[PDB]
């Protein structure tokens, strides 16, 4: 049964509905495609339906190497002792490496441009070529791994390929772990939130559960409220580049050809380091672009993101907003006035109460997003708690943590504490302008950009074996 060409409400098909006087879809008989998630127990009338996972929960750079044996066996290079990774053979972007191509029965990449015949990409996940900056990031990571493996081989001649491969993978995993934690975490939760939720590391603990929960999956999606409706570019010396300096986000989805035939990956990054984000306000909740023309060129009718998210939340079977307020030990409002006081607003609470019957039925995502943010943070007093609890559970359970005893020496720990993303960018390509302390904070030119000449380097002398 095809749901993309039918509206019958039979399993596994869960179509949406539209109200009267819709600004876009004037015909009320239309449908929006939707599918239910795959159950865990297929047919049992006793247990409760549950979903399944597909990737390892530990932060071990699983987005590049994979999580299944055939996939990782088909991504390596078995024709040489060096044990490097596989790269493309037909196209080159004037640099040193590029992602390999892929073959599929149904390729959405071919429909973007009929005369380009550029197919989609392949990586550790199926959604690599869906947003081009993701593709650039994956390419940069692959180049970094290749360079590290080459240098490590050059240091010691008598090793074998497998040892070099595993060593490079371990180095990359520990390095991405440390950068991600130490940079991302302080700029989201805030000082007090982490001082209360994340104490200092003490030792390994095998009595904790490192699994993941549905609530984290549905609550980590706040970033959808920061969308910028355009894509920009620059050149070697900072200035808009002709032709086509600004492109709408609508005609860029699933368009990987713009990465191959034009540009050369570098201008995308150059635009990335020097553009501010979007602030969130109680009356500017989400950009119109993602709500009107999402995946327009690949389907018949454009879809809406927030409606899709709320439909998924309802389908997954999650409790109400009041239950989650009670779960975190916070006061639970019941009346309209209490909602107004707790929301630090009046009109928004009035609209929420009008559109529903009681605060107990408020969905998780709208309740979490609509709340006022904290000071020096970008989350409310509920999403922050959920994210912090999940991250703490994920941290203290992994046995191969880099700070754990028995996995690294004192010299390696001493010399591995000064790895930064700007050095990564300045070393892996021709980028010469970076920020000083936090690339997530410095966002201006020329008062916040210096050449990477005044910057340290990572050394591997301690890794020498003799």
């Amino acid at each position: 049964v095809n749901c993309e060409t039918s509206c019958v409400q039979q399993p596994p098909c869960f179509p949406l509905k539209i109200p009267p006087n819709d600004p876009r879809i004037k015909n009320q008989a239309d449908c929006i495609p939707f599918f239910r998630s795959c159950p865990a127990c297929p047919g049992s009338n006793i247990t409760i339906r549950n979903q399944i996972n597909a990737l390892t929960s530990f932060v071990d750079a699983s987005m590049v190497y994979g999580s299944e044996e055939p996939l990782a066996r088909n991504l390596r290079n078995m024709s040489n002792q060096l044990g490097l990774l596989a790269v493309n053979q037909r196209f080159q972007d004037n640099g040193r490496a590029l992602l390999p191509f892929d073959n599929l029965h149904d390729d959405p990449c071919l429909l973007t441009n009929r005369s380009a015949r550029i197919p989609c990409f392949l990586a550790g996940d199926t959604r690599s070529s869906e947003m081009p900056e993701l593709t650039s990031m994956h390419t940069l990571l692959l180049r970094e791994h290749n360079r590290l493996a080459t240098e490590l081989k050059s240091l010691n001649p008598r090793w074998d390929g497998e040892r070099l491969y595993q060593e490079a993978r371990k180095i990359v995993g520990a390095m991405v772990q440390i950068i991600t934690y130490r940079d991302y975490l302080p700029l989201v939760l805030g000082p007090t939130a982490m001082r209360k939720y994340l104490p200092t590391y003490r030792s390994y603990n095998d009595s904790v559960d490192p699994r993941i929960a549905n609530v984290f999956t549905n609550a980590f999606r706040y970033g959808h409220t920061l969308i910028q409706p355009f894509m920009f570019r620059l050149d070697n010396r900072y200035q808009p580049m002709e032709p086509n300096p600004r492109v709408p986000l609508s005609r860029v989805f699933f368009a990987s050809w713009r990465v191959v035939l034009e540009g050369g990956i570098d201008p995308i990054l150059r635009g990335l380091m020097a553009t501010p984000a979007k602030l969130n306000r109680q009356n500017q909740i989400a950009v119109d672009e993602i709500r009107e023309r999402l995946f327009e060129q690949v389907m018949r009718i454009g879809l809406d993101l927030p409606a899709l998210n709320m439909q998924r939340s309802r389908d997954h079977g999650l409790p109400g907003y009041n239950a989650w307020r009670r779960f975190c030990g916070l006061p639970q409002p019941e009346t309209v006035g209490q909602l107004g006081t707790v929301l630090r607003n009046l009109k928004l609470a009035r609209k929420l109460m009008e559109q529903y019957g009681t605060p107990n039925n408020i969905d998780i995502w709208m309740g979490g997003v609509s709340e006022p943010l904290k000071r020096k943070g970008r989350v409310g007093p509920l999403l922050a708690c959920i994210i912090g609890t999940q991250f703490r559970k994920l941290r203290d359970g992994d046995r191969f943590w880099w700070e754990n005893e028995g996995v690294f020496s004192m010299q390696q720990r001493q010399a591995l504490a000064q790895i930064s993303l700007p050095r990564i960018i300045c070393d892996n390509t021709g980028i010469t302008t970076v920020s000083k302390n936090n690339i997530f904070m410095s966002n201006s030119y020329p008062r916040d950009f210096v050449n990477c000449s005044t910057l340290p380097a990572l050394n591997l002398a301690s890794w020498r074996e003799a």
Binding site: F327, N360, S442
Partner: protein, 104 residues
């Protein structure tokens, strides 16, 4: 699981000595609170017309998306403290952490 090892496994198995399955792939999620459904185990809310949730009707997702999320685009405000790196780092982290399969 072997009594000794030195490198991470390809799929994450045998990471926990007492219970090897915990944390591996192709497993089920975990539940922090009991789930709620239309009839108790499988049917979701809104599948059967004319039913109420906690004594009140349930609105449509599209209607609530149209009424509240809508906002004019000419009154944008740029954040002066944060750059655009947040999108890419969040995308990497969430694509690493989890992925829910969907029937074709």
């Amino acid at each position: 699981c072997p009594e000794q090892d030195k490198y991470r496994t390809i799929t994450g198995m045998c990471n926990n000595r007492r219970s090897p399955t915990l944390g591996a792939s192709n497993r089920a999620f975990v539940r922090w609170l009991p789930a709620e459904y239309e009839d108790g185990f499988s049917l979701p809310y809104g599948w059967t017309p004319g039913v109420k949730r906690n004594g009140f009707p349930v609105a449509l997702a599209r209607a609530v998306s149209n009424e509240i999320v809508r906002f004019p685009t000419d009154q944008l405000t740029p954040d002066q403290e944060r750059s655009l790196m947040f999108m890419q780092w969040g995308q990497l982290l969430d694509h690493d952490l989890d992925f829910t399969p969907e029937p074709a």
